[model samples]
Target: EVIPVTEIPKFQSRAEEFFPIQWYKEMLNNSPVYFHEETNTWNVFQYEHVKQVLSDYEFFSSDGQRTTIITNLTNLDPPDHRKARSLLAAAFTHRSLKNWEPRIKQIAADLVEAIQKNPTINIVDDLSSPFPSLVIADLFGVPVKDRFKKWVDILFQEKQRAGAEYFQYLYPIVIEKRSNLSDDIISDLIQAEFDGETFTDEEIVHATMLLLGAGVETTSHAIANMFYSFLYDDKSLYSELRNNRELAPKAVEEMLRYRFHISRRDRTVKQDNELLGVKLKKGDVVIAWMSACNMDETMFENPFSVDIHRPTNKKHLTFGNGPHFCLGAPLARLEMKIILEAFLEAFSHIEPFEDFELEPHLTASATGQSLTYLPMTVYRH
Candidate 1:
């Protein structure tokens, strides 16, 4: 069932307002544990409550209730979830991940090379939009190029049609990989077995979709927002990082914490309990506002500001919390850091158009509002 979180509040405002920090601030201060009547969902804004709701799946079930993050992987609860996760997670093992850096860096460099040649580009179109999916497609050993972005976006927009279409497209690929395997995820899925129970071709196809859905848009959005942050949030940040290459990872953490929003998840109450100091009941949907929790004053000093030097910035729940924490976080972080490091090497500075507008570039994404276009200039000597 599709749930409209826009129904929570009539946040009738500009696309720039979609970040909704003010709404988050309002809830964090006055109504940290708020109950929306129409949505019939309890919203938890503070870090403590958000962590509690996410981690304690025993009480707050991930039985696929009211979730924002996509995939068969994220919607399952413990014990039952354990098997599927383990089966799929084999593809992401340490040996496999260690080799991805070269592959990923090459992809980032190629995209950056394109931008360097033209020097006039939409950051979203030239880099942020295509980087993640292209890297993923290369990793998956598929030839989707950048064409699959529309399918993924459309699939989320109208779930079943695109899914069935994707199934037809991917099942053949899964079949092809079975006969001719490679050093890729589809090949890994074919080899993955739990207690002598290997995945069926059908399961492999669906699992492929699951991986694409979870990995693509979220990473792309982070890349776009980090640029948005450099241009808008703290203008000095671009030069600051350019000067100190070692600060890349710390900068990435603060970007995830301060710039990224739209990291929220929902769980159904397993049984009645006042764990969050409220009269909870079985089947009540509670939304954990992860991005808001990143801004909880109790969790960070001067929570609204971007602070790369902040020691505890990594504590932000943006990648989520607890048992269902995002498995692909390491890759996402590595990809961004690689892109930044490479871009800094190639370019001396980046500048935003003085007359650039945010309104048109903002579009509705499955995650939330995201930049459809980020027009900026990159300088090289």
Candidate 2:
């Protein structure tokens, strides 16, 4: 018996392309299902196909313990996945988000005020970088003034040996919160129980790390990316959003769909399977090109263009689909909405600095579109 083989195009060669999805799809047109020799995995690019793969966890397992550097909520399979998610689900639900609205708004307002101190500011460093982490730290019950900034620096800055020290700092905090419950997500998680199982201290710590990691980079970059799009790519859209606050939500959705922060997801085939005329063996690694699916022509009309009013904007897979969809999505959306609203209210006009440019960054093993430095002058209304 001969092992089946298919050739994949050189995806990394054209990294310089500002918008590589067009060329990526062009390459996929020739071969929708192929084996990537470099990564040694099966690749799926079509929208519906990627959706199916993401939705069907039984077929493609998310058990990342063996293959990945870190294993958290995203690496678990069903039953366990369902239960783990349910533990934190109550904290992230609509009502819970509503409960968090006041604090979230206050945080946004404070950040916007800080940004107002200067004529021009690096949006990433000044506003986008610290906002989400600070929000997460606050939610985790970290002292916002005392230790939160240090925690953010250690976590996001990738300081050596600081992660362990940060966890060391959090250990007692989490332990103390276990007995004295509070009105915070950490307290909620401390008492979280599902189906006769509760999170162990180690698991709780891991979950806390997961929550912080999830809430930080992706969200900050997303806000910056959306702002970058408006300020650099399309100023008219910014004007429309500023003029009409009602459009902010839809505009955020469009920005997410247009250029999602999570570009790809990895999975392992549990059993031999066939999809889109490609055969896979058990233990095969599969890469779902989510970014490609977001921009696929078959999925969206004028897929490349960012249209806030696009009726089908919600069809985006930015949050991923099915059971393991982003747990922090509701919070992320709410944060973006409140932050942008406060932003539009604070600054009537935004002017980019000379030689401004978009700077993409990586987080959680995925590429996120971002602005390295958005030095912009804002006029107060």
Candidate 3:
């Protein structure tokens, strides 16, 4: 029951127009709130309009076919969403993260050390692609096998086959963890309870799958895009940040604001109202274009350029807003910070390939068009 996004925008090509900044600019200036009659969906582009749609859950409800399909977090509205969020929030706490910091650094160090032997590296495959999933596997206390990669790959593509196969694979693992409850996400889920509601095996299994969908590829895509930004967007950015390691966090925020593309979410209209100026009628579908909103002239000055020093870069809604704001955002942020810092430590500078083409490397990810292959030279300092 997914929304027909391909039928809506109907872009001629994927990589060439993936960012679609020009289209966003036009939409923001002329038609901030656009209605696609073919799909019967309203598209909100400006920053405030998009924010309001994401924030006002009372009017724009989360219960829609167009939203995320993995688990109850995306499917539920306020009261239930609040409950589930709080229950799941235990495992993602500052305490848990503080405990995981050393382990996270170790993982990053391991990856960086191995890549030292490579003079030329595919950033996507060598680093960004495997890091987040490896972190998740370690967090889940599961064995990292070659099959782990294929399972995740197939789970998202063939929702019926591997999704079921993956769940069946985890069923016994969850049962084993129940008896010997220790420090892992599955154990935390089993222990979590709120107001008489406990996670059944079905919810637990689905929650793990949900985490993979929400966390793994999304973070991986952002990491790859960060390297792409360094190599292409601003060539000097890598050296500038390398000179002062303190700026890595700000650089990460700017990358999320500028390069993170196609972050749109859908909501069903609860009641008739002129919220985005020319909207009326109940049961209408409205999509809040967050990536487009990041380019809104009102929120950002000279929005097309990438500047890590931009004071408002962190305000981007890439992690989303309101009740449904990404639960794993902190983890994603930390992963970016650690990965970039580790790469900076390992290499003095990175150089992009001369003959590399953009179109072939671009592939459709769960979030948007992301780099499948990014070639660069890493110099060990």
Candidate 4:
């Protein structure tokens, strides 16, 4: 039932649905690997092919050859990518996340408390929206304020303007840290020397900006989407997690798989190669559909369901696969776990508002179906 190559949807038109999960399903069944003539690109569908593209970085370069103010770690190929990652890897270790657990729990508890006092709250705005940025602000030794939150939002929403403002805002901080280094991530990057080399002031700012923008935005969407998953499909899912606090970790895995952020990732083909029998040329833009892979029936049982108890949920490619896998994954999981535990402890039940509507966009870089706000009412435990 593979789709004929000529029948694949045009790339530009496909952006209308953004993630286009249903279209992905159709492709998975018929044409997992498709060449879009309009864009001169390849759309990699299905679980296995997506993983292959992500893991086989040798054949598919991450470095898309774009100009930017800083080194975008997500866009670099091997050797260079390995060096940059090694430099920043220690900051995102599991032990570091564990150390951050107490503070994360405090934030979650505070948020839950505030929500509990309100009769009805927009979960996205009230909790999910500001939480990650607040965490990032603390991490960067910046003031715990809405400015940093807005910076992250603007960076994601308006890339060019946000980039300019973000780097401009950090320019002073970069200069300040360059001379008077502190113990934060900025200072660490400032002080870091790899192969007898150090990151320039501009490099540090750009990297820090990238961290704030990607870190806060993606995790925020994941948190919002997790609640949406709970309320949208099965109310009992929340009760299950609430009743068994031990399931928090597994539930996080399920949420990631079932409602993962970031639908597709861009890759460039390095050389002529055949993927799923589709011949691709050098410089061909390949869009690895991670969302489709996450919901691939070939990999998971009932791929679309939010089954917290799903044994194979951890195998999902939500955090992606290979060397370019999300570095802040541990931190994200910790935050989700703390928030879920805190909410369950504070609220007996949560239900959506009667007139509330979902505002989802397919083109959102993270989860396409992200909620702008989840208007809901909760009962105190």
Taking the tens digit of each residue's C-alpha lDDT, what string does model 1 give over 195-260?
777899999888878888788888889999998899888899988988888998999999999888
Tens digits of per-residue lDDT, candidate 2, 1-381, equal 112211234334322232466555674586666676765777787888788778888788887423422235787889678888898775675666778889888888988888775667677877777788777877777765652655644675355577787678777888888888877887877778887878776667767877876778788778877777777667788788777889889988887887554466767888778864678877887777676788777878877788777777788887889888988888888888888898888777887766654433322223532445667777876
TM-score versus the correct structure, for each prediction: 0.94, 0.88, 0.95, 0.87
As a whole number from 0 to 100, the lDDT of residue 107 in candidate 1 is: 82
Task: Mark the 10 consecutive residues where model 4 has the least summed lDDT.
Answer: 1-10
Off by over 4 Å in 1: 64-71, 117-119, 143-147
What TM-score does model 4 achieve against the real structure?
0.87
For residues 152-210, could you state the per-residue lDDT of candidate 3 as single tens digits?
67766367888889888898888888898878888888888888878887788888898
> What is the Cα root-mean-square deviation between model 2 and the actual structure?
4.1
User: Once model 2 is optimally superposed onto the true structure by TM-score, how far is the C-alpha of residue 281 displaced, in angstroms?
Assistant: 1.4
Displacement of the residue 331 alpha carbon in candidate 1, Å: 1.4
Best-to-worst lDDT order: 1, 3, 4, 2
* Top of the candidates by lDDT: 1
229 in model 2: Cα distance from truth in Å? 0.3
Residue 367 displacement (Å), model 3: 2.7
Model 3 whole-model lDDT (C-alpha atoms): 0.83
